[PDB]
JSON list of C-alpha atoms and ligand atoms in Angstrom, two decimals:
[
{"chain": "A", "resi": 1, "resn": "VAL", "atom": "CA", "xyz": [26.43, 9.49, 19.80]},
{"chain": "A", "resi": 2, "resn": "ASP", "atom": "CA", "xyz": [29.17, 6.90, 20.77]},
{"chain": "A", "resi": 3, "resn": "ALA", "atom": "CA", "xyz": [27.25, 4.98, 23.42]},
{"chain": "A", "resi": 4, "resn": "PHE", "atom": "CA", "xyz": [24.59, 3.96, 20.87]},
{"chain": "A", "resi": 5, "resn": "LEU", "atom": "CA", "xyz": [27.17, 2.04, 18.78]},
{"chain": "A", "resi": 6, "resn": "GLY", "atom": "CA", "xyz": [27.09, -1.83, 18.55]},
{"chain": "A", "resi": 7, "resn": "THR", "atom": "CA", "xyz": [24.84, -5.05, 18.41]},
{"chain": "A", "resi": 8, "resn": "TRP", "atom": "CA", "xyz": [21.65, -5.10, 20.31]},
{"chain": "A", "resi": 9, "resn": "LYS", "atom": "CA", "xyz": [18.78, -7.76, 20.48]},
{"chain": "A", "resi": 10, "resn": "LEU", "atom": "CA", "xyz": [14.96, -7.45, 21.28]},
{"chain": "A", "resi": 11, "resn": "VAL", "atom": "CA", "xyz": [14.04, -8.49, 24.86]},
{"chain": "A", "resi": 12, "resn": "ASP", "atom": "CA", "xyz": [10.55, -6.89, 25.48]},
{"chain": "A", "resi": 13, "resn": "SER", "atom": "CA", "xyz": [7.64, -5.25, 23.35]},
{"chain": "A", "resi": 14, "resn": "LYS", "atom": "CA", "xyz": [4.49, -3.38, 24.34]},
{"chain": "A", "resi": 15, "resn": "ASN", "atom": "CA", "xyz": [1.61, -2.12, 22.19]},
{"chain": "A", "resi": 16, "resn": "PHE", "atom": "CA", "xyz": [3.20, -2.79, 18.74]},
{"chain": "A", "resi": 17, "resn": "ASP", "atom": "CA", "xyz": [-0.12, -4.07, 17.52]},
{"chain": "A", "resi": 18, "resn": "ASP", "atom": "CA", "xyz": [-1.83, -0.71, 18.05]},
{"chain": "A", "resi": 19, "resn": "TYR", "atom": "CA", "xyz": [0.94, 1.12, 16.33]},
{"chain": "A", "resi": 20, "resn": "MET", "atom": "CA", "xyz": [0.97, -1.02, 13.19]},
{"chain": "A", "resi": 21, "resn": "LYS", "atom": "CA", "xyz": [-2.69, -0.56, 13.16]},
{"chain": "A", "resi": 22, "resn": "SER", "atom": "CA", "xyz": [-2.78, 3.02, 13.26]},
{"chain": "A", "resi": 23, "resn": "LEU", "atom": "CA", "xyz": [-0.26, 3.20, 10.28]},
{"chain": "A", "resi": 24, "resn": "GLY", "atom": "CA", "xyz": [-2.52, 0.97, 8.14]},
{"chain": "A", "resi": 25, "resn": "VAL", "atom": "CA", "xyz": [-0.55, -2.31, 8.18]},
{"chain": "A", "resi": 26, "resn": "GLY", "atom": "CA", "xyz": [-2.70, -5.45, 7.36]},
{"chain": "A", "resi": 27, "resn": "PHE", "atom": "CA", "xyz": [-3.64, -8.26, 9.74]},
{"chain": "A", "resi": 28, "resn": "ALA", "atom": "CA", "xyz": [-1.49, -10.86, 7.94]},
{"chain": "A", "resi": 29, "resn": "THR", "atom": "CA", "xyz": [1.59, -8.81, 8.38]},
{"chain": "A", "resi": 30, "resn": "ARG", "atom": "CA", "xyz": [0.72, -8.00, 11.95]},
{"chain": "A", "resi": 31, "resn": "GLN", "atom": "CA", "xyz": [0.54, -11.69, 12.74]},
{"chain": "A", "resi": 32, "resn": "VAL", "atom": "CA", "xyz": [4.13, -12.32, 11.40]},
{"chain": "A", "resi": 33, "resn": "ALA", "atom": "CA", "xyz": [5.91, -9.11, 12.81]},
{"chain": "A", "resi": 34, "resn": "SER", "atom": "CA", "xyz": [4.58, -10.13, 16.52]},
{"chain": "A", "resi": 35, "resn": "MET", "atom": "CA", "xyz": [6.42, -13.32, 16.85]},
{"chain": "A", "resi": 36, "resn": "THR", "atom": "CA", "xyz": [9.61, -11.86, 15.35]},
{"chain": "A", "resi": 37, "resn": "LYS", "atom": "CA", "xyz": [12.68, -10.57, 17.56]},
{"chain": "A", "resi": 38, "resn": "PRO", "atom": "CA", "xyz": [14.96, -8.46, 15.46]},
{"chain": "A", "resi": 39, "resn": "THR", "atom": "CA", "xyz": [18.66, -7.53, 15.44]},
{"chain": "A", "resi": 40, "resn": "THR", "atom": "CA", "xyz": [19.71, -3.83, 15.30]},
{"chain": "A", "resi": 41, "resn": "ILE", "atom": "CA", "xyz": [23.35, -2.80, 14.36]},
{"chain": "A", "resi": 42, "resn": "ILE", "atom": "CA", "xyz": [24.56, 0.89, 14.79]},
{"chain": "A", "resi": 43, "resn": "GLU", "atom": "CA", "xyz": [27.83, 1.92, 13.18]},
{"chain": "A", "resi": 44, "resn": "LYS", "atom": "CA", "xyz": [29.89, 4.99, 12.42]},
{"chain": "A", "resi": 45, "resn": "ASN", "atom": "CA", "xyz": [32.49, 6.31, 9.79]},
{"chain": "A", "resi": 46, "resn": "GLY", "atom": "CA", "xyz": [33.35, 9.94, 10.14]},
{"chain": "A", "resi": 47, "resn": "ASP", "atom": "CA", "xyz": [30.17, 11.96, 10.12]},
{"chain": "A", "resi": 48, "resn": "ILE", "atom": "CA", "xyz": [28.05, 9.29, 8.51]},
{"chain": "A", "resi": 49, "resn": "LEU", "atom": "CA", "xyz": [25.88, 7.06, 10.63]},
{"chain": "A", "resi": 50, "resn": "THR", "atom": "CA", "xyz": [24.56, 3.55, 9.36]},
{"chain": "A", "resi": 51, "resn": "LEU", "atom": "CA", "xyz": [21.44, 1.73, 10.70]},
{"chain": "A", "resi": 52, "resn": "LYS", "atom": "CA", "xyz": [20.77, -1.92, 10.01]},
{"chain": "A", "resi": 53, "resn": "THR", "atom": "CA", "xyz": [17.63, -3.92, 11.37]},
{"chain": "A", "resi": 54, "resn": "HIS", "atom": "CA", "xyz": [17.74, -7.65, 10.65]},
{"chain": "A", "resi": 55, "resn": "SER", "atom": "CA", "xyz": [15.10, -10.34, 11.02]},
{"chain": "A", "resi": 56, "resn": "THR", "atom": "CA", "xyz": [13.87, -13.67, 9.61]},
{"chain": "A", "resi": 57, "resn": "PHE", "atom": "CA", "xyz": [10.96, -11.70, 8.16]},
{"chain": "A", "resi": 58, "resn": "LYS", "atom": "CA", "xyz": [12.33, -8.20, 6.61]},
{"chain": "A", "resi": 59, "resn": "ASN", "atom": "CA", "xyz": [15.55, -6.45, 6.47]},
{"chain": "A", "resi": 60, "resn": "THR", "atom": "CA", "xyz": [16.38, -2.65, 6.28]},
{"chain": "A", "resi": 61, "resn": "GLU", "atom": "CA", "xyz": [19.40, -0.37, 6.06]},
{"chain": "A", "resi": 62, "resn": "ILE", "atom": "CA", "xyz": [19.80, 3.42, 5.88]},
{"chain": "A", "resi": 63, "resn": "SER", "atom": "CA", "xyz": [22.83, 5.80, 6.05]},
{"chain": "A", "resi": 64, "resn": "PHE", "atom": "CA", "xyz": [22.70, 9.65, 6.87]},
{"chain": "A", "resi": 65, "resn": "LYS", "atom": "CA", "xyz": [24.14, 12.71, 8.46]},
{"chain": "A", "resi": 66, "resn": "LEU", "atom": "CA", "xyz": [22.63, 14.17, 11.68]},
{"chain": "A", "resi": 67, "resn": "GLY", "atom": "CA", "xyz": [20.52, 17.42, 10.88]},
{"chain": "A", "resi": 68, "resn": "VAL", "atom": "CA", "xyz": [20.22, 16.80, 7.13]},
{"chain": "A", "resi": 69, "resn": "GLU", "atom": "CA", "xyz": [16.95, 15.65, 5.43]},
{"chain": "A", "resi": 70, "resn": "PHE", "atom": "CA", "xyz": [16.98, 12.46, 3.43]},
{"chain": "A", "resi": 71, "resn": "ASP", "atom": "CA", "xyz": [14.63, 10.29, 1.31]},
{"chain": "A", "resi": 72, "resn": "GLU", "atom": "CA", "xyz": [13.53, 7.02, 3.06]},
{"chain": "A", "resi": 73, "resn": "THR", "atom": "CA", "xyz": [11.25, 3.96, 2.15]},
{"chain": "A", "resi": 74, "resn": "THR", "atom": "CA", "xyz": [10.06, 2.10, 5.25]},
{"chain": "A", "resi": 75, "resn": "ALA", "atom": "CA", "xyz": [9.55, -1.73, 6.21]},
{"chain": "A", "resi": 76, "resn": "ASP", "atom": "CA", "xyz": [5.89, -1.25, 5.52]},
{"chain": "A", "resi": 77, "resn": "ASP", "atom": "CA", "xyz": [6.63, 0.33, 2.18]},
{"chain": "A", "resi": 78, "resn": "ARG", "atom": "CA", "xyz": [5.98, 4.04, 2.76]},
{"chain": "A", "resi": 79, "resn": "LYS", "atom": "CA", "xyz": [7.98, 6.59, 1.01]},
{"chain": "A", "resi": 80, "resn": "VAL", "atom": "CA", "xyz": [8.92, 9.50, 3.47]},
{"chain": "A", "resi": 81, "resn": "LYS", "atom": "CA", "xyz": [11.05, 12.61, 4.05]},
{"chain": "A", "resi": 82, "resn": "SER", "atom": "CA", "xyz": [13.24, 11.98, 7.14]},
{"chain": "A", "resi": 83, "resn": "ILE", "atom": "CA", "xyz": [15.58, 13.83, 9.57]},
{"chain": "A", "resi": 84, "resn": "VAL", "atom": "CA", "xyz": [17.67, 12.39, 12.59]},
{"chain": "A", "resi": 85, "resn": "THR", "atom": "CA", "xyz": [18.66, 14.74, 15.50]},
{"chain": "A", "resi": 86, "resn": "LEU", "atom": "CA", "xyz": [20.40, 14.68, 19.06]},
{"chain": "A", "resi": 87, "resn": "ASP", "atom": "CA", "xyz": [18.02, 16.33, 21.59]},
{"chain": "A", "resi": 88, "resn": "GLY", "atom": "CA", "xyz": [18.79, 16.22, 25.25]},
{"chain": "A", "resi": 89, "resn": "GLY", "atom": "CA", "xyz": [20.84, 13.11, 24.83]},
{"chain": "A", "resi": 90, "resn": "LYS", "atom": "CA", "xyz": [18.21, 11.34, 22.83]},
{"chain": "A", "resi": 91, "resn": "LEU", "atom": "CA", "xyz": [18.23, 10.27, 19.26]},
{"chain": "A", "resi": 92, "resn": "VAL", "atom": "CA", "xyz": [15.13, 11.65, 17.62]},
{"chain": "A", "resi": 93, "resn": "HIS", "atom": "CA", "xyz": [13.99, 10.40, 14.04]},
{"chain": "A", "resi": 94, "resn": "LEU", "atom": "CA", "xyz": [11.15, 12.49, 12.35]},
{"chain": "A", "resi": 95, "resn": "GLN", "atom": "CA", "xyz": [9.29, 11.11, 9.34]},
{"chain": "A", "resi": 96, "resn": "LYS", "atom": "CA", "xyz": [6.68, 13.27, 7.25]},
{"chain": "A", "resi": 97, "resn": "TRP", "atom": "CA", "xyz": [4.44, 12.04, 4.52]},
{"chain": "A", "resi": 98, "resn": "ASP", "atom": "CA", "xyz": [1.07, 13.29, 3.12]},
{"chain": "A", "resi": 99, "resn": "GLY", "atom": "CA", "xyz": [0.79, 15.94, 5.69]},
{"chain": "A", "resi": 100, "resn": "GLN", "atom": "CA", "xyz": [1.15, 13.55, 8.57]},
{"chain": "A", "resi": 101, "resn": "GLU", "atom": "CA", "xyz": [3.92, 12.56, 11.00]},
{"chain": "A", "resi": 102, "resn": "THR", "atom": "CA", "xyz": [5.48, 9.78, 13.07]},
{"chain": "A", "resi": 103, "resn": "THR", "atom": "CA", "xyz": [8.21, 9.86, 15.62]},
{"chain": "A", "resi": 104, "resn": "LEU", "atom": "CA", "xyz": [10.81, 7.20, 16.54]},
{"chain": "A", "resi": 105, "resn": "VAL", "atom": "CA", "xyz": [12.92, 8.05, 19.77]},
{"chain": "A", "resi": 106, "resn": "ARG", "atom": "CA", "xyz": [15.92, 6.11, 21.16]},
{"chain": "A", "resi": 107, "resn": "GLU", "atom": "CA", "xyz": [17.14, 6.51, 24.83]},
{"chain": "A", "resi": 108, "resn": "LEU", "atom": "CA", "xyz": [19.84, 4.82, 26.97]},
{"chain": "A", "resi": 109, "resn": "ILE", "atom": "CA", "xyz": [18.52, 3.84, 30.35]},
{"chain": "A", "resi": 110, "resn": "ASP", "atom": "CA", "xyz": [20.34, 1.70, 32.76]},
{"chain": "A", "resi": 111, "resn": "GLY", "atom": "CA", "xyz": [22.34, -0.35, 30.45]},
{"chain": "A", "resi": 112, "resn": "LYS", "atom": "CA", "xyz": [19.56, -0.43, 27.97]},
{"chain": "A", "resi": 113, "resn": "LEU", "atom": "CA", "xyz": [18.29, 0.91, 24.66]},
{"chain": "A", "resi": 114, "resn": "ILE", "atom": "CA", "xyz": [14.61, 2.20, 24.84]},
{"chain": "A", "resi": 115, "resn": "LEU", "atom": "CA", "xyz": [12.64, 2.72, 21.72]},
{"chain": "A", "resi": 116, "resn": "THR", "atom": "CA", "xyz": [9.34, 4.71, 21.54]},
{"chain": "A", "resi": 117, "resn": "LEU", "atom": "CA", "xyz": [7.11, 5.02, 18.59]},
{"chain": "A", "resi": 118, "resn": "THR", "atom": "CA", "xyz": [4.38, 7.55, 18.53]},
{"chain": "A", "resi": 119, "resn": "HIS", "atom": "CA", "xyz": [1.48, 7.91, 15.75]},
{"chain": "A", "resi": 120, "resn": "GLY", "atom": "CA", "xyz": [-1.69, 9.87, 16.48]},
{"chain": "A", "resi": 121, "resn": "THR", "atom": "CA", "xyz": [-3.07, 8.49, 19.84]},
{"chain": "A", "resi": 122, "resn": "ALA", "atom": "CA", "xyz": [-0.98, 5.21, 19.70]},
{"chain": "A", "resi": 123, "resn": "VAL", "atom": "CA", "xyz": [2.27, 4.89, 21.54]},
{"chain": "A", "resi": 124, "resn": "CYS", "atom": "CA", "xyz": [4.50, 1.70, 21.59]},
{"chain": "A", "resi": 125, "resn": "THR", "atom": "CA", "xyz": [7.62, 0.85, 23.80]},
{"chain": "A", "resi": 126, "resn": "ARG", "atom": "CA", "xyz": [10.39, -1.71, 22.87]},
{"chain": "A", "resi": 127, "resn": "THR", "atom": "CA", "xyz": [13.64, -2.68, 24.79]},
{"chain": "A", "resi": 128, "resn": "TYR", "atom": "CA", "xyz": [16.86, -4.02, 23.50]},
{"chain": "A", "resi": 129, "resn": "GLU", "atom": "CA", "xyz": [19.70, -5.68, 25.28]},
{"chain": "A", "resi": 130, "resn": "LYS", "atom": "CA", "xyz": [23.44, -5.20, 24.18]},
{"chain": "A", "resi": 131, "resn": "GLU", "atom": "CA", "xyz": [24.88, -8.28, 22.34]},
{"chain": "B", "resi": 201, "resn": "PLM", "atom": "C1", "xyz": [10.77, -3.55, 11.87]},
{"chain": "B", "resi": 201, "resn": "PLM", "atom": "C2", "xyz": [10.95, -4.91, 12.08]},
{"chain": "B", "resi": 201, "resn": "PLM", "atom": "C3", "xyz": [10.40, -5.79, 11.00]},
{"chain": "B", "resi": 201, "resn": "PLM", "atom": "C4", "xyz": [9.00, -6.08, 10.93]},
{"chain": "B", "resi": 201, "resn": "PLM", "atom": "C5", "xyz": [8.07, -4.97, 10.17]},
{"chain": "B", "resi": 201, "resn": "PLM", "atom": "C6", "xyz": [6.66, -5.03, 10.57]},
{"chain": "B", "resi": 201, "resn": "PLM", "atom": "C7", "xyz": [6.01, -3.96, 9.78]},
{"chain": "B", "resi": 201, "resn": "PLM", "atom": "C8", "xyz": [5.72, -2.68, 10.54]},
{"chain": "B", "resi": 201, "resn": "PLM", "atom": "C9", "xyz": [6.75, -1.53, 10.06]},
{"chain": "B", "resi": 201, "resn": "PLM", "atom": "C10", "xyz": [7.00, -0.66, 11.23]},
{"chain": "B", "resi": 201, "resn": "PLM", "atom": "C11", "xyz": [8.21, 0.25, 11.00]},
{"chain": "B", "resi": 201, "resn": "PLM", "atom": "C12", "xyz": [9.18, 0.43, 12.08]},
{"chain": "B", "resi": 201, "resn": "PLM", "atom": "C13", "xyz": [9.08, -0.84, 12.95]},
{"chain": "B", "resi": 201, "resn": "PLM", "atom": "C14", "xyz": [10.53, -0.98, 13.58]},
{"chain": "B", "resi": 201, "resn": "PLM", "atom": "C15", "xyz": [10.62, -2.10, 14.56]},
{"chain": "B", "resi": 201, "resn": "PLM", "atom": "C16", "xyz": [11.89, -2.04, 15.35]},
{"chain": "B", "resi": 201, "resn": "PLM", "atom": "O1", "xyz": [13.04, -1.59, 15.05]},
{"chain": "B", "resi": 201, "resn": "PLM", "atom": "O2", "xyz": [11.77, -2.54, 16.74]}
]
């Protein structure tokens, strides 16, 4: 988990609009989230991980323990049952609600942080640079 720690900034985004759309977000919000480049901060204290997402539009913060289910309310205002795990070197975040699911996967690939969001048939890829 240690190489994930620190400050990272958004450098490239692909297919965010289809993802948002598949989840049910409105056009007006979509406009706004597409011009925005967030800051992500990953910290640790013992066995508790903290995840901050900062932007000029919306801000979020969660704290958890790997492999333990927790309640979360997302940036688009969903209320879900979540669990985060380490699988083959990757940081896998599973969210469940109303009988449906979405995955958020983080990978370190040649100096960089790569995030891939999957919902239904839609798949989005986002890359971050270490600040
Ligand atoms: C998440 C950045 C703030 C903008 C929110 C736009 C509304 C869509 C919500 C999608 C939920 C997760 C998106 C995470 C984006 C990211 O971390 O790169």
